[PDB]
Amino acid sequence: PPPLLVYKWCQGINNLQDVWETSEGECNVMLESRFEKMYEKIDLTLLNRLLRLIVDHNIADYMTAKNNVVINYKDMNHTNSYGIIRGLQFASFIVQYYGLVMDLLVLGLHRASEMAGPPQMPNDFLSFQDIATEAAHPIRLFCRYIDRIHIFFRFTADEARDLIQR
Amino acid sequence: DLHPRDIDAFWLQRQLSRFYDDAIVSQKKADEVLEILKTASDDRECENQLVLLLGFNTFDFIKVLRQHRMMILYCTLLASAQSEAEKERIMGKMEADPELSKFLYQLHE
Amino acid sequence: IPWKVPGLPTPIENMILRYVKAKADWWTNTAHYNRERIRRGATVDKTVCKKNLGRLTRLYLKAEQERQHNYLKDGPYITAEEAVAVYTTTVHWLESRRFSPIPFPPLSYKHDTKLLILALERLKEAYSVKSRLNQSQREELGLIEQAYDNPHEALSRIKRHLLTQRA
Amino acid sequence: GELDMRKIGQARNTLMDMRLSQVSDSVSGQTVVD
Amino acid sequence: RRSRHCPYLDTINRSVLDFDFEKLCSISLSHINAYACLVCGKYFQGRGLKSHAYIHSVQFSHHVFLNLHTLKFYCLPDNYEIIDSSLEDITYVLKPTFTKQQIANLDKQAKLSRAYDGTTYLPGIVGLNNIKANDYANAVLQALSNVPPLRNYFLEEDNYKNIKRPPGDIMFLLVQRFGELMRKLWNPRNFKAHVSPHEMLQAVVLCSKKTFQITKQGDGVDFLSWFLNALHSALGGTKKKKKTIVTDVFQGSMRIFTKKLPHPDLPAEEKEQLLHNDEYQETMVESTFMYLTLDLPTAPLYKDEKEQLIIPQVPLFNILAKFNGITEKEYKTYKENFLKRFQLTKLPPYLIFCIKRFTKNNFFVEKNPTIVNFPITNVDLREYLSEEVQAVHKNTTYDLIANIVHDGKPSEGSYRIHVLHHGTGKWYELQDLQVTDILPQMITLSEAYIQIWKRR
Ligand SMILES: [Zn+2]
């Protein structure tokens, strides 16, 4: 549950390698953000093409056709053609898959692979196969809620200064 | 990976400064290396002279110089040309050779 | 909705249109101001809250229709290059993971009855009995009971719809 | 004259779909039943 | 004597030189004898023993400086001049100078330039940094650029540098910093593919007296009008010089035919009797205009069967109907109504349309969402002129070259600009710092807010 998730996140932050040592000029950064308008801005053609990769073609077509239906209030009604409806029973699955694609965009395939571990022995929530792998990149922790992203970077002095100069 | 645009009139001196701290000695060594590259009988003897100059250290930089000998020499000459007539003279001399023409085209675009 | 009375003289129609425009402007502004009050925190009553909710619902639906028509006019905001970039990234990730696409559920799936039972239980859970359920809700309860009663026929219906239904 | 706004949007949708299908043709392991 | 042989020249790095801001000593704030260190890119006071530049040199071992006002290099602490031809690009970027042949060939440049970093671009098509709320000023300034006559006039400092100005005149900062910004934008050998309008906007806020700030975004049309009027006044030296470049380029002349309506709540007998009064008769109040104000028709307020898209639309010529000697607009001031006719008399070479979107109703400001359906490559304004003026006017076909568009709600709005790149014929959409390529056919689908057309 969310409280246990918070506890795990705190423990992972504390258990990173010399995370609290700031004698050489290191610096840690916690980023939190929300992926604005995620549900509303979901292109349906692109969503269909993405779904066809993971699920049967007929299933994907059915889901897209479902999302493209007519809304109707007491007297008003329009055709929803841009965003997902969010009230369907599989809207959760659609949202999580789109969020996975967004995660790949944010993290990069290499670092996503490093975090998720090899396909044979996937890692746990916050864990790496080795501490060298953990330290190989500025990004140390990542977690996407339904649409809220939390990231934890640890920069050295040179990396931080170069990023600031850019 | 080295590109003709990467080389400016002081790229050689900037590189020598990574082993020689003093500006005067860096300038002297850069000029001597340019002269060696210019008046060189062939690749092996030029590399031997370069190592004789810069010791057994700096061998990575010497390897880069030997790998791209003519490119660096002509790019530095063109970028350091003080006069417009001189610049055009080096441009024509380079164009006289295909490889040097390749370098010129890379420099322009 | 479009309003055009064929027999109404055009000057009277113009006057009515001006009236409606003025009233609409006042309606929108007062709805927004009242919502700012209520949200910022002010003492209000059930009738005012309900009326403001209705007004805000209508305004939001108008805005959503504007959004949909603007989308249909401006085409996909995601360019073809961006689409192919994200698509290639996704396929590369799935290949790396060695993922096997989910198949269409077979006719004799082992757990299909389990999944149907879970779905029906989840649908039933949404009824915290108040003793007053409307026609549609009671009809859905009846359908859920029918599916509970005869699982296999409901599965046949479901697979038929998943294969053919598109409207 | 007038503009048929829907037509240009439909053309752009079809162009995007055509390009995505071009890309998808290369991908192999996809599944589909008759 | 040691000049041409400075051993520290390799120390320079052009990745830190940013000459886009105020030129004052970073320690004493003085404008006098400013030298920029070419190893770190900071400004100090100039030269001599015990000076800030000298002490910085001996402190940090940064031994190369440039006199920001003289364009001469020096090597400190032993101050001797440096002469080297490879340093000319730094001076050029610091103070671009365009020769007459260059300004003549400025538009015929079909080959992209490349900045110091690996970024290709085209002169003029260059982004402007976005301070908090600046997009309106960015768009307006971008539109003002790309006007060959005005741009060419401002690309030579000698043109406007000698004109007189009263003692306590701050309104010349606008003209001189605008010249600086124009030269920076059209610099063909920049160190970066973007420019900072910080100084120009500081001058703008100062001269406007906190109107048109940079932390709050104002109306594009109001900013354009104020800027043009200010430029005209500032270029009018110690008087209202009747013909500046702004007047030569943009200002045309119209003939307004105002007829005071007798009264709405009067009997017909009195109403028609008042006609002979001459007070309610057509007058001729011919005046001048920097920009035409086109008024969109009111939104339909109800959707219809045709063009099922809820978005309305109008032809360009329907809104250009006004400004012909037939139509009559209805002005309504307190206690008085006027029927105003219009008749264009003098057409300027570069014509500005300012389509009125935002209107204040009884309660709030509403943005008209109507889209003007217009051609881009050809429009004939011959008919909207009197036959007495058509003989004088030879060429009257105009082409759109700039189009400023507003997006979003009136409060949380944003501005973008479609610009035609001469030399080529490609249309680029500049948002504050992003440069997209827009197809010619998609310009007409936007809510054109301001437009600039060229007479050919
Ligand atoms: Zn310094």
From Swiss-Prot, chain A:
<protein>
    <recommendedName>
        <fullName>Pre-mRNA-processing-splicing factor 8</fullName>
    </recommendedName>
</protein>
<comment type="function">
    <text>Plays a role in pre-mRNA splicing as core component of precatalytic, catalytic and postcatalytic spliceosomal complexes, both of the predominant U2-type spliceosome and the minor U12-type spliceosome. Functions as a scaffold that mediates the ordered assembly of spliceosomal proteins and snRNAs. Required for the assembly of the U4/U6-U5 tri-snRNP complex, a building block of the spliceosome. Functions as a scaffold that positions spliceosomal U2, U5 and U6 snRNAs at splice sites on pre-mRNA substrates, so that splicing can occur. Interacts with both the 5' and the 3' splice site.</text>
</comment>
<comment type="subunit">
    <text>Part of the U5 snRNP complex. Component of the U4/U6-U5 tri-snRNP complex composed of the U4, U6 and U5 snRNAs and at least PRPF3, PRPF4, PRPF6, PRPF8, PRPF31, SNRNP200, TXNL4A, SNRNP40, DDX23, CD2BP2, PPIH, SNU13, EFTUD2, SART1 and USP39. Component of the U5.U4atac/U6atac snRNP complexes in U12-dependent spliceosomes. Within the minor spliceosome, which acts on U12-type introns, interacts with PPIL2 and RBM48. Core component of U2-type precatalytic, catalytic and postcatalytic spliceosomal complexes. Found in a mRNA splicing-dependent exon junction complex (EJC) with SRRM1.</text>
</comment>
Curated annotation (Swiss-Prot), chain B:
<protein>
    <recommendedName>
        <fullName>U5 small nuclear ribonucleoprotein 200 kDa helicase</fullName>
    </recommendedName>
</protein>
<comment type="function">
    <text>Catalyzes the ATP-dependent unwinding of U4/U6 RNA duplices, an essential step in the assembly of a catalytically active spliceosome. Plays a role in pre-mRNA splicing as a core component of precatalytic, catalytic and postcatalytic spliceosomal complexes. As a component of the minor spliceosome, involved in the splicing of U12-type introns in pre-mRNAs. Involved in spliceosome assembly, activation and disassembly. Mediates changes in the dynamic network of RNA-RNA interactions in the spliceosome.</text>
</comment>
<comment type="subunit">
    <text>Component of a core complex containing at least PRPF8, SNRNP200, EFTUD2 and SNRNP40. Component of the U5 snRNP and U4/U6-U5 tri-snRNP complexes, building blocks of the spliceosome. Component of the U4/U6-U5 tri-snRNP complex composed of the U4, U6 and U5 snRNAs and at least PRPF3, PRPF4, PRPF6, PRPF8, PRPF31, SNRNP200, TXNL4A, SNRNP40, DDX23, CD2BP2, PPIH, SNU13, EFTUD2, SART1 and USP39. Component of precatalytic, catalytic and postcatalytic spliceosomal complexes. Component of the minor spliceosome, which splices U12-type introns.</text>
</comment>
<comment type="similarity">
    <text>Belongs to the helicase family. SKI2 subfamily.</text>
</comment>
From Swiss-Prot, chain D:
<comment type="subunit">
    <text>Identified in the spliceosome B complex. Identified in the spliceosome C complex. Associates with the U5 snRNP particle. Component of the U4/U6-U5 tri-snRNP complex composed of the U4, U6 and U5 snRNAs and at least PRPF3, PRPF4, PRPF6, PRPF8, PRPF31, SNRNP200, TXNL4A, SNRNP40, DDX23, CD2BP2, PPIH, SNU13, EFTUD2, SART1 and USP39, LSm proteins LSm2-8 and Sm proteins. Interacts with ARAF. Interacts with AR and NR3C1, but not ESR1, independently of the presence of hormones. Interacts with USH1G.</text>
</comment>
<feature type="modified residue" description="Phosphothreonine">
    <location>
        <position position="31"/>
    </location>
</feature>
<protein>
    <recommendedName>
        <fullName>Pre-mRNA-processing factor 6</fullName>
    </recommendedName>
</protein>
<comment type="function">
    <text>Involved in pre-mRNA splicing as component of the U4/U6-U5 tri-snRNP complex, one of the building blocks of the spliceosome. Enhances dihydrotestosterone-induced transactivation activity of AR, as well as dexamethasone-induced transactivation activity of NR3C1, but does not affect estrogen-induced transactivation.</text>
</comment>
Curated annotation (Swiss-Prot), chain E:
<dbReference type="GO" id="GO:0016787">
    <property type="term" value="F:hydrolase activity"/>
</dbReference>
<dbReference type="GO" id="GO:0005654">
    <property type="term" value="C:nucleoplasm"/>
</dbReference>
<keyword id="KW-0832">Ubl conjugation</keyword>
<dbReference type="GO" id="GO:0000245">
    <property type="term" value="P:spliceosomal complex assembly"/>
</dbReference>
<keyword id="KW-0132">Cell division</keyword>
<feature type="zinc finger region" description="UBP-type; degenerate">
    <location>
        <begin position="4"/>
        <end position="101"/>
    </location>
</feature>
<comment type="subunit">
    <text>The U4/U6-U5 tri-snRNP complex is a building block of the precatalytic spliceosome (spliceosome B complex). Component of the U4/U6-U5 tri-snRNP complex composed of the U4, U6 and U5 snRNAs and at least PRPF3, PRPF4, PRPF6, PRPF8, PRPF31, SNRNP200, TXNL4A, SNRNP40, SNRPB, SNRPD1, SNRPD2, SNRPD3, SNRPE, SNRPF, SNRPG, DDX23, CD2BP2, PPIH, SNU13, EFTUD2, SART1 and USP39, plus LSM2, LSM3, LSM4, LSM5, LSM6, LSM7 and LSM8.</text>
</comment>
<comment type="similarity">
    <text>Belongs to the peptidase C19 family.</text>
</comment>
<protein>
    <recommendedName>
        <fullName>Ubiquitin carboxyl-terminal hydrolase 39</fullName>
        <ecNumber>3.4.19.12</ecNumber>
    </recommendedName>
</protein>
<keyword id="KW-0597">Phosphoprotein</keyword>
<dbReference type="GO" id="GO:0005634">
    <property type="term" value="C:nucleus"/>
</dbReference>
<dbReference type="GO" id="GO:0046540">
    <property type="term" value="C:U4/U6 x U5 tri-snRNP complex"/>
</dbReference>
